[PDB]
Amino acid sequence: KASSXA
Amino acid sequence: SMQDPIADMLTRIRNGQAANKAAVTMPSSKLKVAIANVLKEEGFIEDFKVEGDTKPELELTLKYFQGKAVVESIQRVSRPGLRIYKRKDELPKVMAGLGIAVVSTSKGVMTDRAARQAGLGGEIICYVA
Amino acid sequence: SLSTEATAKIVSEFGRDANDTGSTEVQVALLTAQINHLQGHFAEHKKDHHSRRGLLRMVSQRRKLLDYLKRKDVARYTQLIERLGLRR
RNA sequence: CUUACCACUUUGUGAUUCAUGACUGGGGUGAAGUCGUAACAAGGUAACCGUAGGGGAACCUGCGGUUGGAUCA
RNA sequence: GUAAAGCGCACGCAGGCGGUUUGUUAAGUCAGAUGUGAAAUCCCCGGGCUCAACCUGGGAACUGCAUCUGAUACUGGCAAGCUUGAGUCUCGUAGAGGGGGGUAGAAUUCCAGGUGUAGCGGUGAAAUGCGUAGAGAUCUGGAGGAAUACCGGUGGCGAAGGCGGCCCCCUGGACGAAGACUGACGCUCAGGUGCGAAAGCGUGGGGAGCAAACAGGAUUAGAUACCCUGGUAGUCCACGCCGUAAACGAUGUCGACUUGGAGGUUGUGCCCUUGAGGCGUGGCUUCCGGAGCUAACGCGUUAAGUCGACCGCCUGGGGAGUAC
RNA sequence: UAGCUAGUAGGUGGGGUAACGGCUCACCUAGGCGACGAUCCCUAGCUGGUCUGAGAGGAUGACCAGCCACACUGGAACUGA
Ligand SMILES: [Mg+2]
Numbered sequence: 001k002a003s004s005x006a
Numbered sequence: 007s008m009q010d011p012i013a014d015m016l017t018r019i020r021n022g023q024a025a026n027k028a029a030v031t032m033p034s035s036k037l038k039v040a041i042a043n044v045l046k047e048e049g050f051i052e053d054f055k056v057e058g059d060t061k062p063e064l065e066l067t068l069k070y071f072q073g074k075a076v077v078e079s080i081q082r083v084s085r086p087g088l089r090i091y092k093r094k095d096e097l098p099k100v101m102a103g104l105g106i107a108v109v110s111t112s113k114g115v116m117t118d119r120a121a122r123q124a125g126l127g128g129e130i131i132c133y134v135a
Numbered sequence: 136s137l138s139t140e141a142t143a144k145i146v147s148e149f150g151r152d153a154n155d156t157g158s159t160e161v162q163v164a165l166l167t168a169q170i171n172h173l174q175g176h177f178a179e180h181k182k183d184h185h186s187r188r189g190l191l192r193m194v195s196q197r198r199k200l201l202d203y204l205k206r207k208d209v210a211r212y213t214q215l216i217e218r219l220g221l222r223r
Numbered sequence: 224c225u226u227a228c229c230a231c232u233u234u235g236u237g238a239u240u241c242a243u244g245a246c247u248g249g250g251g252u253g254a255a256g257u258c259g260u261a262a263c264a265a266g267g268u269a270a271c272c273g274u275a276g277g278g279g280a281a282c283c284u285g286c287g288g289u290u291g292g293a294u295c296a
Numbered sequence: 297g298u299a300a301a302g303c304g305c306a307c308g309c310a311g312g313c314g315g316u317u318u319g320u321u322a323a324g325u326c327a328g329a330u331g332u333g334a335a336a337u338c339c340c341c342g343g344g345c346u347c348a349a350c351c352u353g354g355g356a357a358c359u360g361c362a363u364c365u366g367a368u369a370c371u372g373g374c375a376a377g378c379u380u381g382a383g384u385c386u387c388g389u390a391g392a393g394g395g396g397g398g399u400a401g402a403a404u405u406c407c408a409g410g411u412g413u414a415g416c417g418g419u420g421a422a423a424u425g426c427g428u429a430g431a432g433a434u435c436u437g438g439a440g441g442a443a444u445a446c447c448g449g450u451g452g453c454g455a456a457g458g459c460g461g462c463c464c465c466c467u468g469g470a471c472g473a474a475g476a477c478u479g480a481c482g483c484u485c486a487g488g489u490g491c492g493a494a495a496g497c498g499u500g501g502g503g504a505g506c507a508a509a510c511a512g513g514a515u516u517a518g519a520u521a522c523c524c525u526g527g528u529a530g531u532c533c534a535c536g537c538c539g540u541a542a543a544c545g546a547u548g549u550c551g552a553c554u555u556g557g558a559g560g561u562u563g564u565g566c567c568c569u570u571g572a573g574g575c576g577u578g579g580c581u582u583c584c585g586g587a588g589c590u591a592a593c594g595c596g597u598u599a600a601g602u603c604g605a606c607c608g609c610c611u612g613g614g615g616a617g618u619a620c
Numbered sequence: 621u622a623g624c625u626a627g628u629a630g631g632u633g634g635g636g637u638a639a640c641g642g643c644u645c646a647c648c649u650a651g652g653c654g655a656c657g658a659u660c661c662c663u664a665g666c667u668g669g670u671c672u673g674a675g676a677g678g679a680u681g682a683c684c685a686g687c688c689a690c691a692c693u694g695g696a697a698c699u700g701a
Pocket residue numbers: 266
């Protein structure tokens with residue numbers, strides 16, 4: 001919460 | 007505090023039976039005798055004995071068979087904290103029969119078989135086998 | 136605590152003979168005595184709580200005797216409270 | 224005609240409850256984000272509990288308590 | 297007990313529960329009898345639609361309520377007791393139990409005074425700091441606060457929190473021993489009351505040492521820290537508020553019962569007290585362990601064994617002991 | 621939700637109804653209810669029974685039958701057994 005988005 | 011002798015008797019038997027004790031004493035009562043009687047009369051102990059004047063002393067002779075004692079299990083049913091009155095149809099059958107239920111009736115303190123045949127009911131004191 | 140005479144005295148005042156030391160009335164008195172005496176003890180101090188714990192037991196115990204008496208001998212109780220001048 | 228009762232309805236001031244509200248508080252959830260590495264081994268300053276003060280952050284420090292602390296100190 | 301769960305601890309009203317004997321009562325309890333418990337349903341045995349579902353005859357059932365009459369062991373009520381539970385008295389016994397009040401002995405710090413000569417201090421190493429306007433080292437007396445080394449324990453007392461120098465004043469409880477006396481007066485406790493470490497809060501004192509905060513020196517990439525030099529609130533006293541801690545045995549209270557072994561502690565009784573002492577009998581308290589218990593680790597006559605009474609609390613983790 | 625209660629609780633006497641009754645009215649007593657849960661909130665028609673369950677329980681109240689209440693909403697009487 002949160003790398004590539006997410 | 008000491009609010010239930012009747013129970014205390016039963017468990018003195020059970021605690022004694024456990025430790026391979028040959029005898030068991032206790033400050034006595036009429037009802038303890040009433041009970042103690044059903045135990046001989048029904049075949050769980052050899053007999054009682056009351057060495058008493060003002061502070062009686064009921065004494066029981068524990069039965070044994072092999073290396074195991076005679077009172078397989080002895081349970082206080084009714085209690086001051088919870089009273090149990092059965093009728094006659096509702097009288098309990100310990101061990102599907104092979105076991106007695108000490109019940110106090112208006113014609114005296116007998117067994118479930120006895121209370122049954124006598125066709126009466128009362129406060130079930132305790133299960134024994 | 137409580138003077139051997141003061142004890143003996145009181146036993147021989149409210150009690151139905153000296154040696155009748157276990158009497159209800161006596162105890163009630165023997166207590167009322169102490170309670171009243173210590174009264175000055177925690178008049179100053181106020182912090183001797185541990186003792187006060189003891190005091191309260193005396194007071195408690197007394198109330199439980201006075202009560203016993205009221206259940207038994209209505210007359211002796213009623214006569215007794217006026218006799219110790221308490222209970223209200 | 225008149226009186227009593229009394230329903231719709233009118234006024235003032237409270238209570239309560241449901242919805243909603245710019246803004247705001249923490250919470251929860253999100254394979255790989257940024258900062259550091261507090262805890263788990265004696266976690267590299269033994270840890271934790273109550274409380275108090277401080278500090279981007281986990282946390283840091285004082286007082287007392289606990290062993291649910293490793294070690295021949 | 298460690299999985300969620302024993303209130304930090306006591307006192308106590310209402311309620312629940314209650315030792316032992318006799319008489320009585322007959323409320324609870326038990327027994328029998330009579331009304332009643334609509335029909336349909338369910339269930340049993342049959343009967344009817346070609347079968348079944350469906351429909352239907354009769355019963356059993358409806359575990360109930362009420363009443364009259366009985367039974368009297370247990371429960372309850374009333375009457376009179378009993379003494380083992382509980383409680384008062386008698387003599388002592390041990391004890392950092394409590395509150396109040398003096399004083400003693402080391403030490404730290406500070407001041408004053410002497411010599412002295414350039415160091416002290418601190419660290420992993422350094423520095424800040426204290427001494428070049430003379431410290432530390434160091435010499436003497438005095439002032440003040442805080443706490444009581446050794447004894448000291450594996451101890452003791454207290455409900456718990458907690459309580460250690462010495463001395464004095466008021467005061468709690470426990471226990472042993474003989475008896476004497478009241479005669480079930482008892483156990484437990486929702487609410488209620490009180491006590492309740494340390495920190496914190498108010499007013500006023502007190503303030504040596506130690507020390508949050510804060511400042512400085514170092515360490516580190518950084519270091520709002522660990523370390524070093526300083527140091528304010530605070531710790532101490534008075535009174536009042538605060539009610540929380542891993543307030544722990546993480547184990548509620550009371551009573552009874554169930555093989556042993558090694559100690560500690562404080563008593564009492566018996567042995568020409570003969571002298572190191574011995575052998576009984578209580579209370580309290582460490583350690584190991586049988587059975588039994590337990591998920592196991594472990595508990596084990598101070599149970600977490602075997603029973604009873606009453607209370608408290610738990611119901612997946614998180615959200616949250618938060619919001620309202 | 622911890623207090624509730626003025627025709628409130630009782631008595632007397634009038635009146636009232638098919639009928640007992642604070643049902644009503646005047647006067648007099650100061651009561652009546654509540655931790656064995658009054659009051660106040662929220663939900664709900666009840667039972668026979670139905671479903672589940674070994675039972676004890678939990679869940680439920682359509683169809684059948686018994687009972688109650690309601691008839692656009694609030695209120696009211698008249699007629700009449
Ligand atoms: Mg670490």
